[PDB]
Amino acid sequence: ATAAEIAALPRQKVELVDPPFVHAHSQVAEGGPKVVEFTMVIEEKKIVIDDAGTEVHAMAFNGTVPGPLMVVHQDDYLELTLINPETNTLMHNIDFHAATGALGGGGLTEINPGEKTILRFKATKPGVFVYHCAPPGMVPWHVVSGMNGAIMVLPREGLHDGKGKALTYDKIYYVGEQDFYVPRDENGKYKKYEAPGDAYEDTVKVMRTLTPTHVVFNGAVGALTGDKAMTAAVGEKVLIVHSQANRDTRPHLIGGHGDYVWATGKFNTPPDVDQETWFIPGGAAGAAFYTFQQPGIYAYVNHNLIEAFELGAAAHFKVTGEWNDDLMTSVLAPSGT
Amino acid sequence: ATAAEIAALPRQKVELVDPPFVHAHSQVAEGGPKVVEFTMVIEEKKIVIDDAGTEVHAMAFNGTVPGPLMVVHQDDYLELTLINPETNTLMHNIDFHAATGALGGGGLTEINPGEKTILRFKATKPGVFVYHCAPPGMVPWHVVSGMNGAIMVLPREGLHDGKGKALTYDKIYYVGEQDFYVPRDENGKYKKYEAPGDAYEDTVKVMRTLTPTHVVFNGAVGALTGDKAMTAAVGEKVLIVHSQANRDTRPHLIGGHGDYVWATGKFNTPPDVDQETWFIPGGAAGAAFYTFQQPGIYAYVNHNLIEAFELGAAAHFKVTGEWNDDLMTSVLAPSG
Amino acid sequence: ATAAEIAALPRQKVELVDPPFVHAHSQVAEGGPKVVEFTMVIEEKKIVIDDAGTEVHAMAFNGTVPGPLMVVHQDDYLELTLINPETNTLMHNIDFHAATGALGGGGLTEINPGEKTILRFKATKPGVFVYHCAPPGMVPWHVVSGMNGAIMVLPREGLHDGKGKALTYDKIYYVGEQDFYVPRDENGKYKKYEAPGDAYEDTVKVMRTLTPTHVVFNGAVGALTGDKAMTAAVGEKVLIVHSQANRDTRPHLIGGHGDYVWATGKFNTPPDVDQETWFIPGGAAGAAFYTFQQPGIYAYVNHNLIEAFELGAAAHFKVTGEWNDDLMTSVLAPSG
Ligand SMILES: O=N[O-]
Ligand SMILES: O=N[O-]
Ligand SMILES: O=N[O-]
Ligand SMILES: [Cu+2]
Ligand SMILES: [Cu+2]
Ligand SMILES: [Cu+2]
Ligand SMILES: [Cu+2]
Ligand SMILES: [Cu+2]
Ligand SMILES: [Cu+2]
Structure with missing residues (x-):
């Protein structure tokens, strides 16, 4: 429950890896709840999607489509630092379908180019869940431009x-x-x-x-x-x-x-x-x-x-x-025959 | 149940309310099986569906898209009075996916404008179920003109x-x-x-x-x-x-x-x-x-x-x- | 089981019937595992699919769309003889979703017109499963030309x-x-x-x-x-x-x-x-x-x-x- 009980918890910082691989983790959790920390930078970039050279302007968490998988265990806290560099042109945010409240985080993480934000949520439900950008008024356009990924909350x-x-x-x-x-x-x-x-x-x-x-x-x-x-x-x-x-x-x-x-x-x-x-x-x-x-x-x-x-x-x-x-x-x- | 046994069951008349609200009901059934009575009037009307003033000719149970939610409990009987007023232009009927036989009731409920019908069925399976119009030869056109709703059969x-x-x-x-x-x-x-x-x-x-x-x-x-x-x-x-x-x-x-x-x-x-x-x-x-x-x-x-x-x-x-x-x-x- | 054990199982030849009917079979298995043998000939042939005379060049296992249903029980072996007559024009094969390995059998069954092959696989999981043709580089075209069916592996x-x-x-x-x-x-x-x-x-x-x-x-x-x-x-x-x-x-x-x-x-x-x-x-x-x-x-x-x-x-x-x-x-x- 309390704001200080939470600052008491251990912190583990994870370095993300590009799909289709997944960062190191343990299937059975070692010890009690933790604050697991991740950082992603958003990058707007041209990607080529076929052998004919077809181009899309992708909007990519951590520079990949999909964004990388984050792994935590049930009742850990996930704390994300999300950075929108000033070389980008659009506002972005993040909605975790694993999270409870404020449109999955999207209402608290609207960042213009040059801005960063830190969100923490408690992973109360085990499973794999989608995350994606969802800025008011252009939700499908960021999603179908590649700005989505998933997390896994293991029991x-x-x-x-x-x-x-x-x-x-x-x-x-x-x-x-x-x-x-x-x-x-x-x-x-x-x-x-x-x-x-x-x-x-x-x-x-x-x-x-x-x-x-x-x-x-x-x-x-x-x-x-x-x-x-x-x-x-x-x-x-x-x-x-x-x-x-x-x-x-x-x-x-x-x-x-x-x-x-x-x-x-x-x-x-x-x-x-x-x-x-x-x-x-x-x-x-x-x-x-x-x-x-x-x-x-x-x-x-x-x-x-x-x-x-x-x-x-x-x-x-x-x-x-x-x-x-x-x-x-x-x-x-x-x-x- | 024999037709006699059905005739001695209590009856309860329900007043429907417009979606997204649901008529009053109790979650746990009060007493034994009942005949639960509903009446719907069909209205053909123009609806405007977006802010650019786009129109659909809706075919609406009780005048709403969707039609209203009806709630019974398992092993009650749902008795529906369905009316097609003379102000309408088309034949209509109803098929309850909750019902057993005659195309969910569709084959017993074909009513032209100026007509009414009363259908009764036993709600033998618990769940939420679609109902919809389905007149022979024009099934999908009535459904995608809004002529559908749902019922819930609670345990x-x-x-x-x-x-x-x-x-x-x-x-x-x-x-x-x-x-x-x-x-x-x-x-x-x-x-x-x-x-x-x-x-x-x-x-x-x-x-x-x-x-x-x-x-x-x-x-x-x-x-x-x-x-x-x-x-x-x-x-x-x-x-x-x-x-x-x-x-x-x-x-x-x-x-x-x-x-x-x-x-x-x-x-x-x-x-x-x-x-x-x-x-x-x-x-x-x-x-x-x-x-x-x-x-x-x-x-x-x-x-x-x-x-x-x-x-x-x-x-x-x-x-x-x-x-x-x-x-x-x-x-x-x-x-x- | 041992090699001599597999080689010793009884064999049963089944004559297929066209859909929607199913060949005779028993629900509960009679006796122990068997090798169940089926034969299908592939036919490429024009079929009329609507009442307006619309024609498709179908690619049909055993001459029908869908191909026939084959029934075996869990841990039987299904042994298929698949024939591609010399009057057809394309290579075909077969992928059983019930089988394990070699793209469902597709990698072992690529037969040109004038060829046959015999595949055997063990039906280790009970259920109904799709089978379909899947020649490399032209998989969807054969499937949507009708070259698919199903098998049932009963417990x-x-x-x-x-x-x-x-x-x-x-x-x-x-x-x-x-x-x-x-x-x-x-x-x-x-x-x-x-x-x-x-x-x-x-x-x-x-x-x-x-x-x-x-x-x-x-x-x-x-x-x-x-x-x-x-x-x-x-x-x-x-x-x-x-x-x-x-x-x-x-x-x-x-x-x-x-x-x-x-x-x-x-x-x-x-x-x-x-x-x-x-x-x-x-x-x-x-x-x-x-x-x-x-x-x-x-x-x-x-x-x-x-x-x-x-x-x-x-x-x-x-x-x-x-x-x-x-x-x-x-x-x-x-x-x-
Ligand atoms: O989580 N809504 O897209
Ligand atoms: O109930 N079939 O539309
Ligand atoms: O079995 N894949 O088509
Ligand atoms: Cu975005
Ligand atoms: Cu979402
Ligand atoms: Cu109708
Ligand atoms: Cu229906
Ligand atoms: Cu083929
Ligand atoms: Cu397949």
Whole structure:
């Protein structure tokens, strides 16, 4: 409860890491409640989102789309220092869906260029939750320009299945999915602009059609493919956290499953099990736990397969280990009749 | 129950109230099963849905979009008197998703202007449920002209959580979300018409694109804001009923949560807890229970934020009470 | 188990039947795990999908859209022989969402015209699951040309509710829902093409709008209406399996409910109960169990009612039996 009991608590300062990785943390909390401190700087910057060179003026927490994942435990305090550099042109703020009051923090964190603010909130509910910018009057425009991310509030006793058995992951990846709305010219070619403000009117027109031009993971088409594929091994337990701040998605691991899936993202609601394809509504984050049982390349997609393979929403996993013929085998390889 | 057994049950006549409020009712049922009687009159009327003076020909149960919320308990009988006055132009009917048989009542309730009908059904399943008009051959046009609402069938023992603990609300509000499809002319200006039937063909062309021109709560952009903001106080338990008869939605209370959410709307399915944003498919109602912990303005939105802030799907709650600094505080206010 | 153990299991050859019917099977497994063998031939062929003569070049497992339902039990092996005749023009393969490894089998089953392959996988998780074609670089085009179906892996002890009570169905139907994307010329008329390849660029342009031109059950508008309505009787318990390989759907039985709904399709996740409309994400299958209480015609729809009644997503059930006036009755029939 009290203002002094809080200044009494230990403080841990965390250095953030760029998605899809997640900063070091412990699944089971060591000791009691803490004040966990994070800093993010906002950057307005041009990013290229496909191999054709399509540009968007992104508005990026910590310079990445999505913003990085913050991890705390239930009843810790999260204290954010948020900095809007004077090289930026717009006001920004932050709404944590994990927080209670003042529009998730948004009403207390409106910062013009050259301003900074420090917000603290108590993480009362365990789960993964979206955060995003929401300035009055231009809420969707900052969100669909990339200004969103997620946090994970772990139970103090770590994750468990619906029946109290402990679930401990070997590694965690954070996939942020972003719908972008890029205006086109009369030839069907994407338009380029000087500053974020100049793109505004044309972009609202595309937003009103409710049809994105690109739906991407980690800020671009093919961002998490090739040398940037996520990795695991046979027998490894992986937690994949996925967020979408504006639009629904339906994740699926091609060649795998979600063994336990908190599709709602909230760890006091028991997980669905054995899932093929799960559903995360726009404005939420979800998490899926899987133990890999076969080696090779997997794709991780939004299973509207037009959004995956035409609009960009596909990533890869490269998994090392030995093949299990009991689980699957080619009895007759492709061969002439 | 035999027809005799039904005839000896007490009857109770209910007066409906306009959304987002709900008629008086008790959470735990007082006594045994009843026949609960309601009457609705259908009104075809022009509504203006945004601040640019855009019009829809609404087809409104009891004259509101959405129609009003009706509340019974499990195993009561709902008896509806439905009237289509002679001032209307179209046939109408009603399909209750809570009812069993005859297309939810649609096949027994077809009434032309100048006609009335009385339908009775047993509310066998507890939950919130959509109702809507559905005349053969013109089903989606009546629904997306606002002819839909919801009913709530409470368990006889009131609401409970996953583990049988009782959940009693202080306040209930009913938010009906409506997708509208208004035709535009050559210069992108919304068209006006002089009778509902004149708008039919142009409207169908817009509907087949699957993209609404407006998505609103309580029948208009800004309906539940400012002045018509829903109110509560810190510490009050509030049940928010939300329906969408045609298209998906994903409600979210900005600055709060759904502490218990029956996202499917059905009270025998245990609620999800601690939700940030929940999902109601088109054709269903859902309900979220929350205890307010901070004062101030909250927005309640469909969290496709283009639908909320560009197309109209946003409401406000104004909440009185004292600020809790343990839950949230400004450590350093915006500064140089 | 050992290698000699696997090699020694009994084999059972099953003859498939076209949707919405399902091959004979037992709910409770008889005896121990088996290797269940199925054969499907792929057919590329023009089909007419609406009453205006609109044609699509379908890519059809076993000649139907959707492909047929295959039923095995948990820890059986499914062994599929897949044949791509030399009269087709494209390479195809198959991804089973129920399988583990090699992109669901897609990496091991790429067959050119004139080739066959045999894949075996162990069905380790119980549920209904989508299967579909997925050739690298052309995945959505084969899926939205109809090249998808579902399998059901039953628990060895048959279905049960959340409380472990047995659920035994009398009839099972499979409804496959398909989104099609058919190009139009500048006059608004649907285009026709000589070969499947000729339609590819124009179809991808429509696909990128994310808006189907048609959403159908069993491969055409009205395929499951009229004399092809699905049938049941009052008191029969029906399982309805529904799949959508690419796009979300929200099924609803108009006049009925889903008494138990595995909306995720996975039988180790307890079913939701008393559902009015449930929600199946694109890329999944779901299953709903209902006991019919009232006779008459029911419609079974995607409850975006524009998709149901303008774009094709509506089926009928015809149910025989005696009317139950306790559940529903017309107290006063429509009158002046
Ligand atoms: O199984 N992914 O299409
Ligand atoms: O948290 N509202 O976007
Ligand atoms: O109740 N079906 O619209
Ligand atoms: Cu911003
Ligand atoms: Cu939000
Ligand atoms: Cu009507
Ligand atoms: Cu309906
Ligand atoms: Cu194919
Ligand atoms: Cu798939």
